[PDB]
Amino acid sequence: ANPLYQKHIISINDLSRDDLNLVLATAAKLKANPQPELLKHKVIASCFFEASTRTRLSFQTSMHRLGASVVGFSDSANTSLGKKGETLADTISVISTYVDAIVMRHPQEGAARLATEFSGNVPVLNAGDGSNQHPTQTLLDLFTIQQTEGRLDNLHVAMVGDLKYGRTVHSLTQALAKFDGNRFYFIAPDALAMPEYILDMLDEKGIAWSLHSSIEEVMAEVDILYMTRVQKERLDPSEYANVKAQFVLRASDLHNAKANMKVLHPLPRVDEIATDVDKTPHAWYFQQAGNGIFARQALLALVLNRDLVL
Amino acid sequence: ANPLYQKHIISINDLSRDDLNLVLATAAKLKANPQPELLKHKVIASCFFEASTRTRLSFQTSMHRLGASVVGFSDSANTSLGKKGETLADTISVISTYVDAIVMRHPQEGAARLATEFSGNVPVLNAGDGSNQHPTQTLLDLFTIQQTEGRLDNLHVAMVGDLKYGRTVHSLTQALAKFDGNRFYFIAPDALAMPEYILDMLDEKGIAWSLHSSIEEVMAEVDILYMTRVQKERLDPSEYANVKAQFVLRASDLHNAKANMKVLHPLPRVDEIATDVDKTPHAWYFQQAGNGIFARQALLALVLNRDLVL
Amino acid sequence: ANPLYQKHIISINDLSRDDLNLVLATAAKLKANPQPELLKHKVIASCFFEASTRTRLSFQTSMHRLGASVVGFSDSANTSLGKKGETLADTISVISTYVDAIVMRHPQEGAARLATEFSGNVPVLNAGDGSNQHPTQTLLDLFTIQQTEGRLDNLHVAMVGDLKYGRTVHSLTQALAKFDGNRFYFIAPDALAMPEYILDMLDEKGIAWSLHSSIEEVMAEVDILYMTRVQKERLDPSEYANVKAQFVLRASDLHNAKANMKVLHPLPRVDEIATDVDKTPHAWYFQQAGNGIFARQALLALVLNRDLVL
Amino acid sequence: ANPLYQKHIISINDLSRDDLNLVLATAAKLKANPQPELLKHKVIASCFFEASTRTRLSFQTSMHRLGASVVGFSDSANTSLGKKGETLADTISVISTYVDAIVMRHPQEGAARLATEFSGNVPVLNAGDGSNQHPTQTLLDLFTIQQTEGRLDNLHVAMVGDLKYGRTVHSLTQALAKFDGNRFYFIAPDALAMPEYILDMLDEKGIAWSLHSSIEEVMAEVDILYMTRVQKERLDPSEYANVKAQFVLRASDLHNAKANMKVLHPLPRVDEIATDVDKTPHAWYFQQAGNGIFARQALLALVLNRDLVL
Amino acid sequence: GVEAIKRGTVIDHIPAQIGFKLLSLFKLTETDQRITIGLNLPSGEMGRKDLIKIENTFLSEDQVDQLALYAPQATVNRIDNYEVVGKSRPSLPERIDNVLVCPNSNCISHAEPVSSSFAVRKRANDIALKCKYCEKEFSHNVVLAN
Amino acid sequence: GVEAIKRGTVIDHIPAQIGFKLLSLFKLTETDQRITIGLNLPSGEMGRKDLIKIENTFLSEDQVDQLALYAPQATVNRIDNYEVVGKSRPSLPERIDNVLVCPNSNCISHAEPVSSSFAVRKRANDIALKCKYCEKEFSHNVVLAN
């Protein structure tokens, strides 16, 4: 049976370098040769207790692109009868008697981990558990880094924006810190810097990283430019709008960018990447969303299928 | 490949008399001989950023009646993560990397047209873009006019109600003004009359039309009686409730109606057609809703299939 | 007893020419000669079941300038009454058991006139009952025309904007129609024209009026220009913006106006009067708002005081 | 005229040392010698467009203790103004047509300073404009430090808590920086540190300050300890709870304090000051709230009264 | 007049106060070539007019026609070696990209990264400009407002 | 190049691309009065310069000074009878009105009938601009990112 078979995908941190790679190989296969009736006759629950349409439509399209039935809800409010006293434990205890897998996004951390404890042996897949993990995001970021660059080792990756609270940037650093030779350039506001523990893990492994004031300081060195969305509401309006000449990307700043450089961004995007960056070759965030389908398809195929022939 | 293959259906105005006819022929075929696995393996997005259950359930049942998978949302409020700064352009730019077609209803005009510009080559289908177009409605109205009457040329069509703001009555006039010999009788309040430009297009083509005060003035001449729903909130309560003896339909007024006359109405209905009109033979608005499935099935089959064998 | 002593002020039509000159003569005298302890120890209920902040703050500053105490509320944002079978009748029967006058704004037409049946001997002053009356806004307007034009007779008065729905313009046309030789110009988009029953009464009294298409036509002969808010929502967005250019006043338009010409507006003024008219001597709408105080005091002094020597 | 007669009180920076000793000398005298009919027949608008109940009830109890009448509102829970194009300018131009002073709390920074352009000759007192100023909270604090320490000069003042966002601590540091030989200790988690432009002005004036990590470090030498609310939401939950232990005050911490040491807090006090400090002689935050009355009366007496003999 | 250029376009007899509008609206000013401008001249019969001389740049057929809503009398002199080797006049195009703002407040064109585009029709009397997106039609008066 | 004038102001030595900012921002085209504008004029002395000549118009005192933030090397020259009568350089003002925007989205200057007013403070490595309204201080770099 494959490594990940009937295994719970809850954190990037719990998956090994070999598991990451197995996910990315599968994904690249399904992409080339679609198997549209692999999960035929499975019913999957898409339980968004916090709603996100992009993630939910990446995941439900993944299930359907592999011929699985879906049942589910989205929320950020009162679900339905699920609100009055029904503990998440009890909700899972009942839904794991109906479905074959549970994809769930929830607002409080460790919700998918508590869930694992009530699933019986129905695998749960973490589509976001508060500010803790979002491993499915990181697999599609890694697949896209890997697919534009040829590898995941010896890359000079710049990470920009809210490095303090961006969930995706802390998972992705961990993940790329399981591969050899990587150099990270962290560009963020003092108020939104890379948390000390990311940095300290990075040092225990001998990984080279550096803090930079702006993007045009690393522009020429960077293979991947991972932008994250700077959140207005976490900052005073005058504070946010200040930061000298900002950390937004525009097309002219891409003139001294390497040929192979791609600008990735988990999305929504509003301020931080300007529309002219879209028609540049270095624009890769919409294709990055597209690669969510293959990353998510792979993950449902391996967890739900014994021996995966592709 | 058929005329409409991979083509964007956005406005009645952009489809020719021959396209309308091709849509209606296909539809009449699928109706007779259902092909339930034609769109097998396509995933279609049903993106209602404004919600309508009837339209959404006509369309999703059309997709399923042709064996397609659906992913989507409805709204009229906060969708999910799709709200914060994610421009419609960006939303489409990401969803056209997952699906095979995008059916979308949205509150502001030209939203499906701006969408066309970010779909790549994924066809978008307009389920309503504000007060501008709703071409899928008009195809099912035309299919029903045609199916009760045998033709779309040389009909005496009466249109009643809010001819000023009714989206459906302006699309349907345009459409039937691409066929020969039609005569329109417009019956509406002074406050809610047929906009001058419909009338002026109608004159450039030599099409006979006339304004009438009430329904019993045309009752005997009319082949189709297209009622629309008069909206209370656009009028002062005393104003609305006045209009002498009203423009509501009742069964006795149907006594001098021709044998072949059918009363159509896009629905909801509340005030304007009374319950006794339901048991009369001239009641055709629920079967009119039923014909939405065949009109919508045809449109998804042609846009998504090369050579359509039926 | 003065003639309004203990009367309920519910509609303009209930008041005679003499009652109108009485309220307006008093307002003049109370503007000249302030009477700050006249209603001391009187408690007035300010019941705004429909929240209208400006009418409310004007009414309660008035009550305070004669030393009355104010108790009351603004619902819209809700309190408790109105729901749970609490009929308005029952509410008034409880409130007039401890106040001396009731000032009320209600959403349903006829509500002040129903309060009148249940308050017994506490006076009910109408701050607005739906799309029916608002007597106190017509008394401050008539006070502002009198104050500036020196007369209420023989005027040339242009009513501009939304004439069909404007409550304010219907009452003023009825109130000035009681004085002699007034001449009216109505400038309105045709969808918003002055409704027949006002024009009908003007005919019956031999009072002259005409309809003009642009303000330019009539600027020269006009003494009072009353602008009303064209509720944007009364038209579709493309109907609204596309009149021929518009019916908005800008200072340039005023360059032929007579020295005595005043621009009046009930407010809110969104865009119908441009900012630059403010600086003109003719702009009178804020001064008009301020005479709401005087006209509103007049009423409370007259209704509540048997005899007045001021 | 006293020097603040008819002035608009919008910012601390606008007020001189002498204006500050004038407001504070009057507050002392009005606490000793109550003046209950001084503003009789004056009407004050209390416009709280952002609802802050404590500042409101303090301001309107003050107005009542000099016999002024109060009219006004608290939006947040909404009224009618603010929406439907009603520009704040236009609102102020109508309100100052019948009140004598305007006390306003607004969410946008700069709003009180814009009211000032349109009120003409009615005074505008700032009860809080966004993240900018709140002069009246600094005057009650300075009054409470003066009342207890006997001076405003030569103090040892510790500012503890959220120093970066705390509006209150920025104004007090600027206000005490006008008096001599004040010495400041700033104790703040580094994410919430006192922003450079305050420290910058302190340098320019040769005013001493240092940053300390725990309150224990500085307890012995401190006269005034000003605690600010660490908005829990300003950090992530695990950042918040995990400082080294915290920056919360408990009575034990106070056992080295000087007899004259007072603990001050703008309130709400959620958990930064434990319940058991209340019982200490040093707890002064409720007494501090109560001098809001005196400092708030001072202002209204001085702005509205030409001459004051108390 | 100012005097003469070697190579380029001279747009002459633009009304007066339309000259700046044309420089800004259609971005003529973001070239590196020497543009000289005369605002409120005479030297093209009427009285006062504007003139824009852009050298080493010549305007395409459609760029000339873009000027027709603002400038329609304007003559677009194609100049080579100090003589006018050609003279065009703005005429109505059938589409006007980027320069107008759809009157319809609920049209999606507003919120979004799309350039406006209008369909022009009729001539001389009233020019009706129809939106690409909301497909609503407006008189060119109303479009040229705010 | 463009020829000399009789009377007026000639605002010489504008660096490139700023000459159009100056026309827009200071609304100098709104006069039906003779203006000669030369953009991307050579002058070996700067590579490229722009030069506005407004005839029979005298930009006085503060007006000169407002240009200090945009083209601080512009020689402003009076000509009031056929030649240069006075010569002026932009000096930084203590306040800059109308032309700037407040960078604070929550300053009330953004929705209301209000002219921006900023106080100028020159802080060594730049100039700080402090808004009248929200009172926040900004690096002019942030106020001109715009």
Ligand SMILES: Nc1ccn([C@@H]2O[C@H](COP(=O)(O)OP(=O)(O)OP(=O)(O)O)[C@@H](O)[C@H]2O)c(=O)n1
């Ligand atoms: N080297 C040249 C030649 C002419 N012009 C300009 O070109 C226009 C003259 O075009 P031309 O056909 O030579 O002159 P006419 O149109 O015959 O002049 P008009 O109609 O005024 O008599 C004018 O804008 C004049 O400023 C120019 O800028 N440079």
Ligand SMILES: Nc1ccn([C@@H]2O[C@H](COP(=O)(O)OP(=O)(O)OP(=O)(O)O)[C@@H](O)[C@H]2O)c(=O)n1
């Ligand atoms: N009636 C006049 C007089 C002079 N000029 C122009 O004004 C400048 C002449 O002023 P002056 O300061 O003596 O000349 P420069 O030495 O060229 O000025 P600077 O060196 O500062 O550029 C020139 O650019 C010339 O175009 C003009 O336009 N009209």
Ligand SMILES: [Zn+2]
């Ligand atoms: Zn449009």
Ligand SMILES: [Zn+2]
């Ligand atoms: Zn500001």
